[PDB]
Each structure stands twice: as C-alpha cells, then as structure tokens.
C-alpha cells in the first residue's frame, strides 16, 4: 500500500 | 541533464525459423523520459507493439521493454529504432539471434 | 531471502497544455503489481499481478484516492520547483520520487528510503536513520527547512517501519506461489567464430528470478574481465530475466576457458565450458 502522508516540496 | 539510452534487441526465448516468439527491445539509462521506439521488419514499422510502464534506476535515469510477438526466418530482418532528444538521428540497432 | 516493496512515480510538466503526465508503479522485489498512469482510461489504481486482484473494494479505493493525492503533490511541486529554480514556464521539467522497504531473511525491517529527483538530479532524500534528510542544494535545504518543522519524517519512519513491512509481509504469503519461488538460471554456452583463429565463447543465463545474478569469466583458474563483455540484465518480458558473459579467445583453447553463474536460486555457483564437436 502507499503512504497516506502530505509531503510538499 | 540528458543522458542518452542503451539498447539491448532480443528474443524473449531462444530463436529457431518458424517458432513463435517475442521480439524486445529493452531501453534504459536515459535522461528525459519522452522516447520514440518502434520495432521494425526489413526496415517497416510493425503496428502491434506494446510496452512497460516507465520506471527508473537509483541513478533516476529511465527504463522500457517495447515487444511484439514474431516469428523468426532465414529471410526476415528485424531491429529496433530509437528517437530521443539527445540523439542526432533516430539509432537502428539490428536483432542478432546470437545476442 | 531478502525481500522489498517499492513505489516510483514519475511526473512530467506540460507547459503547451494541461496537467502534467503522472506515472506511478509498485514492486514487490522485481514484480511490478500496480500501476497508475494519468493518461489511460480506468483513472484508477490498476493490479498486475493475480495475486493482488483478491484485494476488495476498499483496497482499490484508497489506493486510487492515494495515488491521485500524490499526483496532486508532484504537481504542485513542479510549479514549487520552478519557483526555486527561477525557471520559465515554457519548458517541460520532471519530478521523480521513490519509496519503499526493505525486511531481511525472517521479514523483519531492515531499511527504509524515500527520495527524490528534479530534472534527474537528487533533491531531497531521507537519511538511513528515518530522521534526518540530505539536501543536494539550497533549493532542497528550503524544502528540508519546512518538512523539519512539519514532523515528516516522524510519519515516514512510522510508514517504513510498520504499514510497508506490513502489507510486503501480506503481499509475500499471498503472492508466495512465485514472489516466494527462486527461478534458477538456465544456462549454456554458444561459441561464435571471428576467424580461422579467433573465437567468441558467450555464456547465458536465460529464464532467472529475481533478476541479480553474476557471471565471471576464468582463465586457467584465474578471473579474466580482459577482451571480455557482459551486457545489462534485461526482463525476458514473462517475468524472468536474461544475462550473457562473452570472452574472445584463441581458436583451440577454448578449455581453458570457465564460465561462473551465481544465484540465489543456486545452492552452488555453476561452471561452464565450451563442449568441443
Ligand atoms: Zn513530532
């Protein structure tokens, strides 16, 4: 499964 | 910024005259991922051809297997032609059953 | 064995027109099992491989409405990284990241990563600790400035660490009809004359999964990587991979000459040599 995780640059 | 693909043009098993098989071309280590392959058969584009989804090395730079079902002959030419931005003129590399 | 889950996703700005090109694929070690791709059809996420077509609704619904929600990042990231970059928006640029675990012979965690790539060079990566990053340049130190006030890598180490060993533990017994068979190389050597004098011997190594393998040359007992080839693994397209070794040696002495195949697939490395008549 992928991550569920808010990583802007 | 631009890294120029590798082609490697082979079977997927290995070839007789008149078996069924699997014609690759396998490209990588290229750097942007927009490329043109087509596989040919003496020097025409062979319509049927499908490819990987694009993923990429821990170098970054990018990979694809373009392939189509063939049959070998004595008479048939087979290769594979590359376009991409850091290539002058599309590259032809020829299938060699031996390589 | 030593197993892996890996995720790479690929975004490609289109200045002339619209959103990007977004591109995403998953492994369980060289199996690729899912697939997004923003210009097909289903705009979902996609299986390919059975085993994970048993996987219910709810399986496919989150990983779509994740995978969409990455490639929302990478496109707000292109337009970040132009800004960072002080560059037009006229040309096409490109965003690539990885992620994934690695979990050792007893399937316990061994090792996480999680990068990324702007124009095909490193930007940000997470340490090998899970809780620091290195930042190629000061464009990356800004991003590494703001995911540090944000506790990022807290929910990556929590991600690598548990929920990816977890579902690549699921993934394995569920696949284990072939993520968990090794695929030993089958091999033979081909002989190709360059002249009256001169021979090429060429050993294969056809059909083998996973794909790392390694073929050496011996020359009376001795290693020779002189007048020698070795091309690039390459997927044979079912599954399997492909690999061949090339020495050129003096017509007659061709005995003196010993290939060497090691695979996880083999219990003993393989020798080789040229079968004269
Ligand atoms: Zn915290």
């Known amino acids: 499964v992928l991550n569920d995780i808010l990583s802007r640059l | 910024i631009q890294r120029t693909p590798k082609i ?11 078996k069924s098989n699997f014609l690759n071309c396998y490209v990588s280590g290229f750097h942007p991922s927009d490329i043109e392959v087509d596989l040919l058969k003496n020097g025409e584009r062979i319509e049927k051809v499908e490819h990987s989804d694009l993923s990429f090395s821990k170098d970054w730079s990018f990979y694809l297997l373009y392939y189509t079902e063939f049959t070998p002959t004595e008479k ?20 060699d059953r031996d390589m | 064995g030593s197993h892996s889950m890996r995720y790479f996703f690929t975004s490609v700005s289109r200045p002339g027109r619209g959103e990007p090109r977004f591109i995403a694929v998953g492994y369980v070690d060289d199996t ?13 996420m996609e299986p390919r491989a059975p085993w994970i077509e048993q996987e219910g609704p709810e399986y496919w619904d ?9 490639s929302q990042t990478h496109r707000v990231d292109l337009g970040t990284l132009r800004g960072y970059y002080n560059q037009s928006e006229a040309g096409s640029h490109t965003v690539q990241r990885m992620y994934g675990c690695d979990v050792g012979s007893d399937w316990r965690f061994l090792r996480g990563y999680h990068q990324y790539a702007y124009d095909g060079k490193d930007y940000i990566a997470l340490k090998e600790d899970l809780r620091s990053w290195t930042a190629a340049d000061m464009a990356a130190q800004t991003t590494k400035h703001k995911w540090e006030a944000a506790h990022v890598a807290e929910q990556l180490r929590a991600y690598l660490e548990g929920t990816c060993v977890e579902w690549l533990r699921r993934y394995l017994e569920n696949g284990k009809e072939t993520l968990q068979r090794t695929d030993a190389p089958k091999t033979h050597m081909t002989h190709h004359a360059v002249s009256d004098h001169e021979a090429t011997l060429r050993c294969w190594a056809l059909s083998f999964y996973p794909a790392e393998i390694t073929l050496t040359w011996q020359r009376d007992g001795e290693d020779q990587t002189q007048d020698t080839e070795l091309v690039e693994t390459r997927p044979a397209g079912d599954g399997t991979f492909q690999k061949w070794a090339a020495v050129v040696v003096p017509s007659g002495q061709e005995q003196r000459y010993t290939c060497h195949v090691q695979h996880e697939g083999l219990p003993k490395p393989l020798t080789l040599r040229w079968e004269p008549s």
């Open chain 2, 8 to 18: 490697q043009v082979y079977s997927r098993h290995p070839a007789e005259n008149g």
């Open chain 3, 32 to 44: 690729q099992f899912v697939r997004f791709d923003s210009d097909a059809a289903s705009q979902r």
């Open chain 2, 76 to 95: 048939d030419e087979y290769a594979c032609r590359v376009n991409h931005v850091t290539l002058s003129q599309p590259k032809i590399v020829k299938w």
């Open chain 3, 62 to 70: 989150g990983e779509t409405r994740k995978v969409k929600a990455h």
